[PDB]
Amino acid sequence: VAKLVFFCEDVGSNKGACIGLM
Amino acid sequence: VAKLVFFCEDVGSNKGACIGLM
Amino acid sequence: VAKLVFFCEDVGSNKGACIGLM
Amino acid sequence: VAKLVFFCEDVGSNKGACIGLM
Amino acid sequence: VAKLVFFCEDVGSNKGACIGLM
Amino acid sequence: VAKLVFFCEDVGSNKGACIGLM
Amino acid sequence: VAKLVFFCEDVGSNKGACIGLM
Amino acid sequence: VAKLVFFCEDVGSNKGACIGLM
Fold first, then answer.
1. Contact G/A (≥3 CB pairs under 8 Å)
2. Exposed, middle or buried, E4 (CB in 10 Å: 0-12/13-18/19+)?
3. Beta-carbon count within 10 A of D2 CB
4. F21 touches chain E (CB under 8 A)
């Protein structure tokens, strides 16, 4: 985003994970 | 969250809109 | 824009990074 | 996001549409 | 304002705080 | 942070650029 | 900003202080 | 702020005047 920033989910407990994107 | 972390939700078409949290 | 609105740009991998602006 | 908040694109060469999100 | 433009307000002590407007 | 909070960086000329984040 | 929102930065060599602004 | 972004004063001496900052 430059630094690396996590993008995390919270979709009905489908996921609570994240991914690094610049 | 400290550091910036993006939290995403469904918007349709398997796309995510993500806001930042500290 | 007043009121807060999120303005997003694609960071890849189906995710959009959005910040609040007025 | 609660309250209805608008999300818009300024990605680049694809002008800005928006949608409301909670 | 489209484009990002910062609007600033003096908080004294040689500094002003500025928010984004579209 | 929830609630919007402005996070500000110095950008010179005794001005802080401030972004909303949760 | 109306309504009271906190504005924060990172003071000194490192500690985060905020103030209320409208 | 990258690109040049205008920082405009809201009240006081130089209201309506802006400077470019990064």
1. no
2. middle
3. 6
4. no
